């Protein structure tokens, strides 16, 4: 009975390999778009990151020249 | 069975990269939420 | 009287523009803090 329950549980056991071929092809496609989307995601995250860095630098300069203003 | 091995490797790296991606937006969103909370806190202290 | 004056430095210090100078430095640091916090509020809202 483990033989029976393993032989029938093979995904693709009752699925013809050619629709696996299309599903795999479209999987690499949507993969291409998902790393693309990650490219825009990371570039705008870095953009906001160095906006934050610029405001950090401006605030630090303000602190420095304020506490040395007296 | 070579195609099946290709499939299984396919889903394992796909789910791994989805996990990495999702933790990336989770962490950046939590950092942004912390920044907004700090901004509100400093505005209240003004 | 003179003994009590002698042991306490604080009273002898108590015993006039410096206060105005301290007020000016406090208000200028307060206003620069307000300005930088306004800048942070404006920048972070994007």
B46 touches C34 (CB < 8 A) = yes
d(Cα A22, Cα A15) in Å, to the nearest integer? 12
Structure determination method = cryo-EM
C-chain CB neighbours of B46 within 8 Å are: 34, 37
* Of the partner residues A55, A62, A70, the one whose CB lies closest to the CB of residue C43: A55
d(Cα C43, Cα C35) in Å, to the nearest integer? 12
Length of chain C: 46
CB contact under 8 A, A62 and C36: yes
d(Cα C3, Cα A15) in Å, to the nearest integer? 105
Give the resolution value in Å: 4.3
d(Cα A60, Cα A68) in Å, to the nearest integer? 12
CB contact under 8 A, A51 and C39: no
Chains that touch A (3 or more CB pairs under 8 A): B, C
């Amino acid at each position: 009975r483990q033989i029976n329950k393993l032989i029938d549980s093979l995904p693709g056991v009752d699925v013809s390999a050619e629709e696996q071929l299309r599903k795999i092809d479209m999987l690499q496609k949507k993969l291409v778009e998902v790393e693309d989307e990650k490219i825009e995601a990371i570039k705008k995250k870095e953009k906001l990151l160095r906006h934050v860095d610029s405001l950090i630098e401006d605030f630090v300069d303000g602190i420095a020249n304020s506490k040395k203003s007296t | 069975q070579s195609r099946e091995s290709l499939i299984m490797l396919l889903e394992e790296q796909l789910e791994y990269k989805r996990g990495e991606i999702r933790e990336i937006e989770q962490v950046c969103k939590q950092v942004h939420d912390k920044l907004t909370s700090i901004q509100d806190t400093l505005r209240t202290g003004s | 009287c003179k003994s009590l004056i002698s042991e306490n430095e604080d009273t002898k210090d108590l015993l006039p523009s410096e206060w105005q100078d301290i007020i000016h430095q406090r208000e200028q640091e307060l206003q620069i803090k307000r300005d930088v916090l306004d800048d942070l509020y404006r920048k972070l809202q994007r």
